[PDB]
Amino acid sequence: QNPMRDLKIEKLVLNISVGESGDRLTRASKVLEQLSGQTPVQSKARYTVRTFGIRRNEKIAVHVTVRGPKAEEILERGLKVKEYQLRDRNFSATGNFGFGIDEHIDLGIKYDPSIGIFGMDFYVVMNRPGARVTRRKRCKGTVGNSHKTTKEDTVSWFKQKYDADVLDK
Amino acid sequence: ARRPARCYRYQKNKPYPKSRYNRAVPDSKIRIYDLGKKKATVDEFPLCVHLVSNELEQLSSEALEAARICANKYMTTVSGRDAFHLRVRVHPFHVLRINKMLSCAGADRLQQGMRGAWGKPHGLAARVDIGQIIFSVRTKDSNKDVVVEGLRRARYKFPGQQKIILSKKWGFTNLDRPEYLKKREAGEVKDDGAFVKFLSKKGSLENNIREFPEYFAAQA
Amino acid sequence: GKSHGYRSRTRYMFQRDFRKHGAVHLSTYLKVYKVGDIVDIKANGSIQKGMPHKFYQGKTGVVYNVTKSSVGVIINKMVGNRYLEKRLNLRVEHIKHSKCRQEFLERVKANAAKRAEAKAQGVAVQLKRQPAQPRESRIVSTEGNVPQTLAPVPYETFI
Amino acid sequence: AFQKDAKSSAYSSRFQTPFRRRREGKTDYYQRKRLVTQHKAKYNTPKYRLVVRFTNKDIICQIISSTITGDVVLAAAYSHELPRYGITHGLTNWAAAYATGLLIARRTLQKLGLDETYKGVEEVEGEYELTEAVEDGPRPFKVFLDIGLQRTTTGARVFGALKGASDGGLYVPHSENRFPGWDFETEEIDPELLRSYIFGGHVSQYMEELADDDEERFSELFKGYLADDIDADSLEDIYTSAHEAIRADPAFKPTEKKFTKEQYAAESKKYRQTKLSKEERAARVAAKIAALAGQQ
RNA sequence: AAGCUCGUAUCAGUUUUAUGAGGUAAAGCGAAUGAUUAGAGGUUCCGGGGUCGAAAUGACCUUGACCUAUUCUCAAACUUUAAAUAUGUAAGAAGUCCUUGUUACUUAAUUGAACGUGGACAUUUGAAUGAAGAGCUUUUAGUGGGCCAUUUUUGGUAAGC
RNA sequence: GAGAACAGAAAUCUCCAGUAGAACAAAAGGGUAAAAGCCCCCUUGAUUUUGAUUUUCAGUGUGAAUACAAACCAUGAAAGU
RNA sequence: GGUUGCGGCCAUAUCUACCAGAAAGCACCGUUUCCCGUCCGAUCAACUGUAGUUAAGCUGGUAAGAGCCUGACCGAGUAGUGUAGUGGGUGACCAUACGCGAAACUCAGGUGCUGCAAUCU
């Protein structure tokens, strides 16, 4: 029973939570921009904390969403940073996962002091076909519990391909 | 200084509790309601006597605390702590008011007659109907005289008429004595803390059979 | 110190029927209102335009006008020792027909048909209504229903 | 498969369910009120809506008025009945939409008695023109577009079917800024391009572009055209003749019903489950208590 | 007080029938919101404290918060529900039925809407009871400090307040 | 709630559940979910003309509000507002 | 009888969890030249019904299921209430007469019906 119960990446979300705006933020944006080929999008802080120097609507951070073979491309070159090794967690209860990296140069980008060094959060978000049902306008249904993604199925997929293990729990 | 209870005996005013509107009230003098052997199964204390009001009046938290102390002390003197479960089935929620018109001399320090006579809180009181139960005890059947005596001794510390009535029905609960017995025989009962849970014929058989295997199990 | 605004004392009135909030149903708008039709007034808090004042809640009037979105209702209002003719521009969400005169017109049709049938067959319909009359004589049989004797019960507490 | 949400008994008690078409996700009652409600001083005049819906494989254009017991259909045209006029592939595209609108217009006017007058545009060049009125005679049949939930956008097929209806003769008030060929800067229309969209110029342009760029995609796509001997030079003539025959005879010859209502009902009720009985529920309960008590 | 137009016209501090409106009394909170007594079973890497411990989302212990199902008790400014009394409308001649004119309004349309012609149904003509006449107008006096009782009810300990 | 470098009880991202437990300038109350809330686009009907109506009420005034007409505009695919 | 479109009344229709579905339809599904829209052809827009599957959505069934609906000499003619008395009672409050009359609890059953059109071994 696996005709269309095949698990595939909905998308990959690349995030950098730079803590301020100006040079650091726009440079992080450039990093994402030439990493993805897609014009990234800048998010703003949703309230004020004052321990960190962030407040409302200050253009705090950057992210971008990628899909398809470019998504799994960026994913494998970024997973090779973690050496095909995750934890028992890093995997959501719903069937997604993610991992953080430092020194993004590990994904093939020169130092280039006109950019500088940034970390990243990668989040892989998964699905089985028939997710239009939950996103389309007309007749927006749910997905049945058979066809809902799950942590176990997602881990089994990520294991049986990618040559990846779950060291460190 | 705490003017008498004849001044607040009768349900003259509407109920007036601690709210966002009326705030800044004094605490109750009765704060404990369950005492004796509270961590006791229903099967241990088959008796009950109730102290029932026979008047539509309102009682004070002070009187409730006093009656509580008196009754507990008598019960504990004779029968012991592990012998009874005194529950106070009434709660002082109605707030009482004072205008507080001064007491030295109203010639120049006038206090303004009845201008602005709305009062501030004085204390707390329970509004008690006729037939409304007060002071359940639930002992064993052989502590009957003691419980009657203790409730009758508490009875002096309230206004109005109160009656001490015997009960069937395992008196924490409803469900008369033989019916409780036949259900406990059939296995329709579980001992949850201080009060039981009863079988229903409504929920899923999953839950009913994991929670009540003895009922239709054919081994006993 | 007092407050006597338009929607004063209207809290529970213009509440909205538990589990009947929002999304007015469209038979309300498809219902047709001709001049002379009797209509009951029952405001809807969800439609803030064209509302009645709280006086006219549950009052039943007659239509004098018909407009785009509304109808004009006539009411007779007590002011002292008299009644006064009040005209209300109210939207149709606050308005419903009257099953009273509906039933009256049914009885009209039946009275006409009955009078016709009688003019054919047999005169003296007696087509008015009469109140509930006292019931006639009858015979109440035992034959299996013997009278069961009841006694007053003694006092018991069961508490 | 999940529990911690656990809709409680109180929640389920005081939950107000939406209307059924809303729960189904098929209707906007906001739009429906705004669109169905009539000026109450007309007292009886139906407000007719041209309901244009797009499934996969079919376009569904209906002329509907509203009533309490339920809406009533004056006329209804589909795309799947175009093969008797000469369209057999791409019968859910912009051009089939135009032709379906043309057909509902002509069919409606036929049965309504207003076909000799308000004959509509038979010189289709994309020039934006509504159906002006004829003095010394009736007015045209006014009918309002019901889209539903698909997004108002410039280049779309609800608008194709509208343009077809208006050309076919119906009065359908609309603006020209959602027909394709409308420029975001200069507020004017490109009716030559629009005529191309009517006559498949974009589909034909794509067939040419594949057939001289990529041939495997052209082989799997459009193979109905290859098999029916059609190529990308006479799609205009196809839709032209389809328009002409739609204008010739729109009178809705239906199917032949092929094992009629009773035979269908039998073959359905065979596989449609009976529900259950109360005694049967009691018996299954008895069986569960006996098995999960005695255990053989 | 003067009358005026009429003489069963139309009416009514009343019931019944039909149809509505209401959110008080009651009740309810193992239903929402707030208040509230008691234990019982789960629960954290994500509470505190101590133990076996160089560390381990490593092992154990008490209690608090949480959750689950129970549980005693409440609300003038809470409520799913929901009275009695009080309340609106109607109970046909200015009515119902059929055919058919006007319109500059409306309709896709002599389709609708309004007012109508013409014809048909009358004395159990469309519940009850009563109707010491019904309807209409003008003008003008005194008054514009109130008090009591039953019942509902606020303030106040209460008051011949 | 579960997940993701620095990231921690709270910073940004993703999914889940979520009948409103939020917000709607300002009291409180009502009302509102492909919304009356949040975001975006276009705008000035917050215009003109003078009348009928509802509340307060003497059935006066003011204040506010309602529903139309004759115009002119905005909006949108349009119904409509 | 099923399905689609458009609906009416708006839970007997909602929710949790399992199981089935022939035909047709719906659906997922395939690609991005053109209109169109996004950080992302995911949503939206368009093009093919071609390459594929009922996996989901969808419909129906199941559950001593939760919820909701109806009924009940079920509680209960109880609570409450209109009217009455030179009635009882220190009072608080109560009974009685002529009347109207609930909610919770309990039990039983039930779990969408239906209009217009089009189509389906």
Numbering used by the authors:
A (entry chain h): 6 to 174
B (entry chain o): 1 to 220
C (entry chain u): 2 to 160
D (entry chain t): 2 to 297
From the paper:
To understand the precise binding mode of the extended macrolides in the yeast ribosome, we determined the cryo-EM structure of the mutant G2400A ribosome in complex with TEL with an average resolution of 3.1 Å. The resolution was further improved with focused refinement on the large 60S subunit, leading to a final reconstruction of the yeast 60S-TEL complex with an average resolution of 2.9 Å and extending to 2.5 Å within the core of the particle. The density for TEL observed within the NPET of the 60S subunit was well-resolved, enabling an unambiguous placement of the 14-membered macrolactone ring, C5-desosamine sugar and the C10–C11 alkyl–aryl side chain. TEL binds within the NPET of the yeast large ribosomal subunit with desosamine sugar extending towards the PTC and placed adjacent to 25S rRNA nucleotides A2400 (2058) and A2401 (2059), consistent with the DMS protection experiments. The alkyl–aryl side chain of TEL is stretched in the opposite direction with its aromatic moiety stacked upon the base pair formed by A884 (752) and U2978 (2609), similar to that observed for TEL binding to E. coli, T. thermophilus and B. subtilis ribosomes, and distinct from its placement in the ribosomes of the bacterium Deinococcus radiodurans (Berisio, 2003 #4141;Schlunzen, 2003 #3935) and the archaeon Haloarcula marismortui (Tu, 2005 #4874).
Macrolide antibiotics bind in the nascent peptide exit tunnel of the bacterial ribosome and prevent polymerization of specific amino acid sequences, selectively inhibiting translation of a subset of proteins. All macrolide antibiotics, from the prototype of this class, erythromycin (ERY), to those of later generations, e.g., telithromycin (TEL) or solithromycin (SOL)12, bind in the NPET of the bacterial ribosome, close to the peptidyl transferase center (PTC). They establish interactions with several rRNA residues, including the adenosine at position 2058 of the 23S rRNA (Escherichia coli numbering) which, while conserved in bacteria, is replaced with guanine in eukaryotes (G2400 in the yeast Saccharomyces cerevisiae 25S rRNA), and is thought to be the key determinant of the bacterial selectivity of macrolide action. We show that engineered yeast cytoplasmic ribosomes with the G2400A mutation are capable of binding macrolides, which contain an extended side chain and that the binding mode of such compounds in the NPET is analogous to that on the bacterial ribosome. In this study, we demonstrated that binding of macrolide antibiotics in the NPET of a mutant yeast 80S ribosome inhibits protein synthesis in a context-specific manner.
